[PDB]
């Protein structure tokens, strides 16, 4: 059990991976530029897509959500729920 890319990192997240960043009643898209697995627990480097990366938004694995059709479905539900007239 090991990725051909390299040694399997202890953290469940890897650099270049796409993840979701929430901070309110809606879920937004984000990307992991890099991660520090040299410790457990630890911080992770993430920035909002389509915006300046100089913002450097460092966050713990707790505020990080894995990308999956199910999480997207929830955003899609919230997105539909958000719409009204």
């Amino acid at each position: 059990m090991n990725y051909s890319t390299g040694t399997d990192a202890n953290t469940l997240f890897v650099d270049g991976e796409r993840v979701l960043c929430f901070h309110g009643p809606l879920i937004y898209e984000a990307k992991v530029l890099k991660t520090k697995p040299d410790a457990t627990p630890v911080e992770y480097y993430i920035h909002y897509a389509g915006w300046s990366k100089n913002w450097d938004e460092w966050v713990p694995e707790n505020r990080v959500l894995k990308y999956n059709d199910d999480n997207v479905k929830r955003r899609q539900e919230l997105a539909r729920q958000c719409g009204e007239r």
Side-chain angles (χ1 to χ4, degrees), residues 2-7:
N2 184 253
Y3 299 91
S4 182
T5 63
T7 307

Side-chain angles (χ1 to χ4, degrees), residues 16-65:
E17 185 177 14
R18 184 175 296 178
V19 302
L20 305 177
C21 184
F22 61 91
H23 187 74
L26 281 157
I27 301 171
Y28 300 92
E29 186 177 308
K31 190 176 78 175
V32 187
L33 201 81
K34 58 180 180 180
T35 172
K36 185 176 181 180
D38 186 68
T40 63
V42 64
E43 55 75 36
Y44 300 84
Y45 195 106
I46 316 189
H47 57 120
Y48 298 90
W51 298 104
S52 65
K53 60 182 179 179
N54 303 143
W55 189 286
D56 302 33
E57 196 70 22
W58 285 44
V59 287
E61 54 181 327
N62 183 258
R63 203 90 68 74
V64 183
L65 184 61

